[PDB]
Design a protein around this ligand. Sequence first.
Ligand SMILES: [Mg+2]
Ligand SMILES: [Mn+2]
Length: 254
Amino acid sequence: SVTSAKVAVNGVQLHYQQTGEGDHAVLLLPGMLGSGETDFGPQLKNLNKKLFTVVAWDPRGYGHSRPPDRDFPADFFERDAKDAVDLMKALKFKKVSLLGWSNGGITALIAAAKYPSYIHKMVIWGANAYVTDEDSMIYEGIRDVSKWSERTRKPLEALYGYDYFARTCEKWVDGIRQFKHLPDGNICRHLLPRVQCPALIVHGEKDPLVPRFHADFIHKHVKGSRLHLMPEGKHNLHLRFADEFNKLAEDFLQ
Ligand SMILES: [Mg+2]
Ligand SMILES: [Mn+2]
């Protein structure tokens, strides 16, 4: 049983979903253009409701956190990280663990580094702490939503409507693209050494959007982190292998 609602945080009404009664609060952070509704169906239903209290948020401009419309300033990842922790604080949790997928994992790495006393543990997958030419190219091939597989496009076209969907996707490529021009193509390489909580980095060896070197780099610099490779996993491994991923995360969080 899942409840959806909005809460006022930093000038925006953020939408989120909540389920469970457990004393271990967990925030599910979605990837680009994501939402609790489209990115975390299997988690919101299957994660142990006895052990955890699960919340899936919609970053401003994504999901149902509209208005406002999504924009991508130089600090958009840090802004999402602030909103994410302020949202959990708004919901009265005193500490939380984080499950971050893709851009959501980047956000989670940032939150843990900036608000270490608030974060217990974290599980991230498909994140990249910087942008390279290989990434830049990958993102260019993702730009046009029309070129997306009817399956991957259906839920998002339904959520936002084509126009907003395709357009936001464009601004995202332009937004994630801006980092290549900073020293080291940096997004958060400098914050990895500041992550102080136990971290589990999962990576699908067949992930087509994020090269494995990004998972190896984050494992290397996040002290005490563990890196788990899934031979058949792709970028959406928590959906394609929900039961397998869920056990991995639940075993790690306890
Ligand atoms: Mg360098
Ligand atoms: Mn929502």
